[PDB]
Amino acid sequence: KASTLATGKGIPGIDPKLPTHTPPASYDVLSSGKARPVQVAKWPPMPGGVPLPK
Amino acid sequence: PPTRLSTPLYSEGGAFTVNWWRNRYGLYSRRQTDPMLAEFLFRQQVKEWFYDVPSYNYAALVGLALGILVAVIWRHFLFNPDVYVRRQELRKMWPDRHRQFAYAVPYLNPQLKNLLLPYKNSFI
Amino acid sequence: FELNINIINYNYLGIIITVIISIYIYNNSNIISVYNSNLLLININIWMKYNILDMLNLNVLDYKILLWIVVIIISNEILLFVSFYWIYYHNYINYYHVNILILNSYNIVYNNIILLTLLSTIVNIKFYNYILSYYKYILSYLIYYNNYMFNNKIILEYKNNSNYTNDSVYMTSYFYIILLHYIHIYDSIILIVVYNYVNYKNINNYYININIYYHLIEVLYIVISILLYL
Amino acid sequence: ESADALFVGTLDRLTAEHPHTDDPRFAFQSNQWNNCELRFTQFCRCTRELGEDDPRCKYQYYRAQTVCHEFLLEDWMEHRHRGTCDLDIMPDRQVIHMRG
Amino acid sequence: HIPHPVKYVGPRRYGRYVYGMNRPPVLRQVKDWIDWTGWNSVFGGFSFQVAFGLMIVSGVYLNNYRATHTLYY
Amino acid sequence: YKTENPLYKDDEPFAKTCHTFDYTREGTEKNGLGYYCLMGLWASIFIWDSLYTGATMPTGVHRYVWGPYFPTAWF
Amino acid sequence: KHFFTDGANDYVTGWENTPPLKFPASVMKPCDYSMTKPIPKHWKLRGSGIHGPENTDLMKLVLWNRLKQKRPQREVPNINYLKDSIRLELSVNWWLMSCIFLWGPWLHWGQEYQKVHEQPPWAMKRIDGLRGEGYFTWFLE
Amino acid sequence: ISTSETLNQKILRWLDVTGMLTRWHSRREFILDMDPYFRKNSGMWTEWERKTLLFLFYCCTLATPYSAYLDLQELKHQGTKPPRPVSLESRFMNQRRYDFTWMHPQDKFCSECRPVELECKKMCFDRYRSMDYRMYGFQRPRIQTYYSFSTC
Amino acid sequence: GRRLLHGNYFTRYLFGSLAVIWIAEYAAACQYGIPRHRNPNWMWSWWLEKQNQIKNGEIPANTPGYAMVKWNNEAEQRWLKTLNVEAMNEEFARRREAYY
Amino acid sequence: WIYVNERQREPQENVMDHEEFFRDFDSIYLGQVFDHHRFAEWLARRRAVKWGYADQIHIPPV
Amino acid sequence: GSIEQFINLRTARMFIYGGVSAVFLYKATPVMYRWEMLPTFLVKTEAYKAREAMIAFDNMKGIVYGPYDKGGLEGPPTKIPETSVGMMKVDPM
Ligand SMILES: CCCCCCCCCCCCCCCCCC(=O)OC[C@H](COP(=O)([O-])OCC(O)COP(=O)([O-])OC[C@@H](COC(=O)CCCCCCCCCCCCCCCCC)OC(=O)CCCCCCCCCCCCCCCCC)OC(=O)CCCCCCCCCCCCCCCCC
Ligand SMILES: CCCCCCCCCCCCCCCCCC(=O)OC[C@H](COP(=O)([O-])OCC(O)COP(=O)([O-])OC[C@@H](COC(=O)CCCCCCCCCCCCCCCCC)OC(=O)CCCCCCCCCCCCCCCCC)OC(=O)CCCCCCCCCCCCCCCCC
Ligand SMILES: CCCCCCCCCCCCCCCCCC(=O)OC[C@H](COP(=O)([O-])OCC(O)COP(=O)([O-])OC[C@@H](COC(=O)CCCCCCCCCCCCCCCCC)OC(=O)CCCCCCCCCCCCCCCCC)OC(=O)CCCCCCCCCCCCCCCCC
Ligand SMILES: CCCCCCCCCCCCCCCCCC(=O)OC[C@H](COP(=O)([O-])OCC(O)COP(=O)([O-])OC[C@@H](COC(=O)CCCCCCCCCCCCCCCCC)OC(=O)CCCCCCCCCCCCCCCCC)OC(=O)CCCCCCCCCCCCCCCCC
């Protein structure tokens, strides 16, 4: 299984080593070293992603 | 027509071909009991019937006769005023069958009648 | 070695059956006809006995020969119904505007379709058991109940109908087409009453014949239902 | 006073002015049985609206005679007089839509 | 006849029945059964009635409602 | 050892001989897209005939932006 | 399948034109000697040469077709075969379900509507004064 | 009530009062329910065949009560069929060339009545009875007999 | 295992044939220009006018058609002797009061 | 047995007067579906009157 | 702020699903009533009452003793035949 190119080596999905998708993994600290802030929403998001003033 | 079973027979793809015919020829056969014998009998029938030149003439005739037969049957149902399949007009008295009467005049004047009627003077 | 076919030299049922047929013509009482019909049933059974005894010949083509005979018989039954449909539709232009009450499209058609569908399901289960070399006693009695209801419903319908064969060609064709179907239902009773388990199984022509015949009757009713009720 | 006046108004008018010629609705077929039934039904309806004495309905009967043989008309007229002619039954007393 | 694999991809065994424990939801079970025995029989069996029912019941709008609102006289 | 459940094995192929059965190029195994298009057209004609009763009796007034010999006029 | 065919659905005798694919070609093979190489001239015909049991493959085909008729266990077919064997049975059963649960409800609804409004819900109401239910299959009018 | 089981288990148990669900879920219970002669062949069945057979069998039996209900309603409908208007004898209605005697070629009962015209036969049987000739039928009120399907 | 017919032959040739029949019929109607609007009513103009009068209330409800014609057959003359529309309407009115 | 059992019973009132039916079309034509118990009792009384045994029978109330 | 505490995904699948269902019943119930789809025992439509008010079970006219009405001024026979009088086997009252 996926031993040779004919068997599917290097083909994502068919090859066990390669995943079908490569979504970024989650992290608990920012690269700066600050803790990642957490925001629990209770209303739908803004129509255009417009941020509100501080 | 090959004479050696080793030489394959050319076949096209579709619903009426050499391969299609081979699959179904021996379905009801008690004589095609093994590959060698089955192929020999299959090619024997194909050679005798499909490689016979005059046989194709009858194939044309059956096609023409059936084509006319289907057309006349279909034309009566579709266009003949006297033929009823729907029931709306049959539930009314004759004077009220307006929709059915629409077929009358056009059905009375087919193209061929107009073309050939002027040739009555070849007889009278 | 042996001959390919074990020839049958003599037979005397043919004379008896033919004479039984003649008795119908030469009767002076309808009571003789009733008893004559029993004789015909007896002698036909003897002929069926000869077919079962022919199994001793161990001839592979016997099954095929009888199966194709049934196919021809089925075609004749279909063509007989076609003639009745032909008769019905020839006078189609004279229907639906005469002062007669045609049948309703709600009650009779639905229950009959449901009832006859159950009959098909019972026979299908019989075929499945025959494939599996298995038997279920209750199945036969479901058919008898099914046939009992069909007889009870058809008898009442004829008696309570307010129009008669002499009223119009429409009524004649309705009654005749329905009777022709009933006769074929009754012929099914004649066949199914002997259903049993035989241990030689899939070389028994009776099972395939019954499955084909019951399917034919039911499909014919669908055509009748569309023509007359719907 | 128009060339196509016959067709205008009704297809009926065509044979009302030319009684002995083919009717447009039944010209395609040699069998004229349906033509006779339509003519008789027209006569029956005329009497209901106008009455027998009206000259119009008298002519409608003549039109029926042009295509209906007398042995048919005598029988059908007998049924009409009794009140059992299925053609002349009043619409509110028809049974065609009953029980299906 | 064209040879082809078995298309059933659902679970092949639920395990021994133990008073109906550790078994899938009922709707999932119905879906598995039809997958196991073939959807072709379901579609073929229901096709005739669906076609007839839709044609008849469509007349509620096509024949009855539309006609009342669409009569030029 | 390792085994395969017989119920989920694939169909056996036809034997390859002088007399070989082959249905691969026939295209008769299942109804194709063309069949389902015919069904779609039948539904459309059924609905269309009921919805628009006057379609069979079309209007005779002809109005063309680019005349009657322009392709869009023909359709 | 229900119907018996000598070629494919031969359940009366169980004859098969070719052996199972399980056997190696050395053990048993389909009877095909169309590819036999030309016979050397110095070889002499000993047997009849007639197609029949003198050929090894045909002899093994006849032998197997008789000795296969006793087997210790069932040769289980795949689900595709089992589906095909009862295709009609399953489809008729689903047709019965459709009649009960689809046709029945709307047929009952139509009769109830007909009671109140004199005509089925899928029919144009009449204004001609005739009484009765009228047609049922509207599209055949 | 029993609290030793869940509600689902209780419902399944009662639906299993005849053992249908138990035979479905146990091959052993199914084969032992066969008679000994046919149990001999049970070993060859696949589970697909066994359960598929039960599914077809249960659908058929479960549908039989529904058909019976329809038939009973049909019998009740025919038992109290509303009267219909007497037919007006139209142009081509009630044409006769000869009397109806094909049912009784020699006896010729009810020659004027049609084969299944019950009301005509009833009055015809009454004449025969008044002539000292017995005839069977049409004498018991429908509401005083069993299986009439006409009782209130 | 070898196939003789189309894999889906039964459904293919039943629905397929019905589809072709329906589509052919629509084409035939277009070529001949047949009106496709459905009328479930009789087209007798005089009768339809009388029915409208009943709906408007000009003619009393439940009045028979033979009570409105200018020529009556024998059977209708028999019925006219026992016809009482006024009594029939009162009886219907009484039924409504009892029901409500 | 089905035939014998039914033959004993008096026939149902198959038809009635043409004009009387239409003068009460709604009640007769639709009576069964609206109330089959009362409709069945009504039929029984008519059969008793038709064959002249009304005074000899006591029709149960509905 | 004081209402944010009451949004808990159950309240959002009980308000959103519960709300759409209410609209469906509010807009569909009148249509079912008009088309006689509602159960009769639950409620009777005005059209149902109008038809039912016209039904009675006390009409004893139109009894005839013939299968056909042949027209004329006499009509079908209306008098029971003498031979049929007293031919019914009625259980004792
Ligand atoms: C009967 C059966 C019915 C079945 C019902 C089934 C219901 C299913 C569940 C429904 C649940 C809905 C709520 C869930 C939350 C919203 C979804 C969400 O957040 O998804 C993530 C989605 C994206 O998430 P994200 O990607 O993470 O966010 C990144 C960005 O920041 C944000 O992303 P973005 O930057 O991409 O932008 C978001 C979005 C912005 O969001 C929206 O646009 C939301 C629109 C909502 C409209 C709702 C109201 C209109 C309908 C009214 C119906 C009335 C019916 C009356 C019935 C009467 C009966 C008698 O913008 C776009 O997507 C761009 C759209 C571009 C196309 C616009 C085309 C407009 C053409 C107009 C032409 C007109 C011409 C003629 C002139 C006409 C003048 C009038 O979030 C959003 O879209 C954010 C905005 C959400 C707003 C929700 C508004 C809900 C309003 C409810 C009103 C209820 C009123 C009740 C009245 C009283 C009742 C009795
Ligand atoms: C607390 C108790 C609660 C009880 C509730 C009621 C339950 C009643 C169930 C009746 C089901 C009858 C189904 C008939 C089709 C054929 C069945 C079949 O294949 O049997 C094979 C079975 C065994 O055949 P096998 O060949 O030896 O074995 C074949 C298989 O290998 C092995 O076969 P298998 O074992 O797989 O068979 C499976 C099953 C396959 O069939 C089914 O599962 C179908 C189930 C359909 C349910 C129908 C329920 C109907 C209830 C309607 C009630 C309406 C009330 C209205 C009220 C109105 C108010 C105004 O077959 C049966 O189990 C059939 C019934 C067996 C009973 C036999 C003993 C005599 C009758 C005893 C009745 C006791 C009733 C007590 C009531 C108490 C209530 C508190 O056959 C027999 O046992 C011999 C023949 C007798 C069977 C039919 C008995 C009919 C009894 C009807 C009772 C209900 C009457 C309701 C009248 C309502 C009037 C208003
Ligand atoms: C619109 C809504 C309403 C619709 C209403 C519809 C009404 C339909 C009414 C039908 C009445 C029932 C009839 C069938 C009852 C049995 C049903 C049954 O058991 O089915 C399941 C079962 C399925 O079999 P299976 O082996 O399990 O198949 C498994 C798979 O399906 C896969 O199987 P496979 O594909 O692998 O193949 C194996 C199987 C496949 O076969 C079947 O399964 C047959 C299925 C047929 C079902 C019915 C469909 C409708 C057929 C219409 C045919 C029209 C013919 C042309 C008419 C032209 C008119 C101008 O082969 C056989 O079983 C062979 C059977 C023997 C055939 C003999 C044919 C003889 C006539 C040949 C044509 C003659 C004219 C030649 C003209 C040209 C001359 C140059 O069918 C049978 O086993 C039945 C075979 C025994 C009965 C055959 C009856 C033949 C009658 C021939 C009449 C010829 C008349 C010629 C003159 C006409 C013009 C004057
Ligand atoms: C802005 C405006 C927007 C507007 C939007 C408007 C929206 C409109 C929506 C319209 C939607 C249209 C959709 C069209 C495309 C359809 C695509 C499709 O799927 O087509 C294929 C689809 C199914 O075909 P298929 O894909 O080939 O089927 C797959 C099978 O699984 C193939 O597999 P198989 O071959 O293995 O199948 C099993 C097969 C396997 O075969 C075997 O096992 C071998 C043996 C076969 C031969 C059997 C011989 C006989 C058997 C004996 C047993 C009989 C038992 C029953 C006995 C009964 C006794 C009474 O066995 C059977 O199937 C037969 C045995 C089962 C029982 C047979 C029962 C009797 C059948 C014959 C009678 C039928 C008529 C009955 C009538 C009622 C009762 C009288 O075809 C249809 O569904 C037909 C199309 C219908 C179109 C109707 C169009 C008009 C209606 C429109 C309604 C909406 C309008 C609303 C108003 C709108 C106004 C704006």
Ligand SMILES: CCCCCCCC/C=C/CCCCCCCC(=O)OC[C@H](COP(=O)(O)OCCN)OC(=O)CCCCCCC/C=C/CCCCCCCC
């Ligand atoms: C969170 C969302 C939840 C949504 C839930 C939706 C539930 C919808 C439930 C719909 C129930 C519909 C029931 C209709 C039954 C009609 C029965 C009927 O008419 O019976 C009579 C008729 C026979 O009567 P006759 O007098 O003989 O007349 C006809 C022949 N002459 O018998 C039958 O029709 C028998 C067949 C019964 C059909 C039962 C249909 C049940 C449908 C249930 C649907 C459930 C949907 C659930 C959706 C959940 C989504 C989350």
Ligand SMILES: CCCCCCCC/C=C\CCCCCCCC(=O)OC[C@H](COP(=O)(O)OCCN)OC(=O)CCCCCCC/C=C/CCCCCCCC
């Ligand atoms: C015989 C009557 C049976 C009634 C059955 C009712 C159920 C309907 C469905 C099954 C039957 C198929 C017909 C369906 C028709 C649907 C459309 C429709 O209503 O068409 C009506 C229309 C005509 O009705 P009217 O308008 O009243 O007449 C106008 C002037 N003549 O009918 C038709 O044209 C179709 C009827 C014929 C359909 C069958 C096919 C005809 C051609 C057969 C050819 C036979 C020869 C061999 C063919 C070989 C093919 C490989």
Ligand SMILES: CCCCCCCC/C=C\CCCCCCCC(=O)OC[C@H](COP(=O)(O)OCCN)OC(=O)CCCCCCC/C=C/CCCCCCCC
């Ligand atoms: C132990 C005893 C068991 C008895 C019960 C079980 C066995 C049942 C056997 C099957 C019975 C099948 C009967 C078939 C004939 C049915 C006759 C029938 O119903 O005919 C009437 C029906 C409708 O008529 P109307 O009364 O006008 O309908 C109005 C509705 N009120 O149709 C007809 O009239 C057509 C009659 C056709 C009868 C054909 C039967 C065969 C008769 C042949 C007689 C030949 C006699 C000459 C001498 C040769 C003798 C062979």
Ligand SMILES: CCCCCCCCCCCCCCCC(=O)OC[C@H](COP(=O)(O)O)OC(=O)CCCCCCCCCCCCCCC
């Ligand atoms: C003896 C009498 C028998 C009964 C009468 C039968 C008469 C008709 C028989 C026809 C053949 C039936 C089987 C057909 C099988 C099938 O579907 O066959 C399907 C095939 C496609 O095959 P595959 O998809 O399987 O490859 O379809 C075709 O070849 C033709 C149908 C496709 C759609 C055609 C479109 C027509 C367009 C018409 C104009 C529309 C105008 C619209 C304007 C907006």
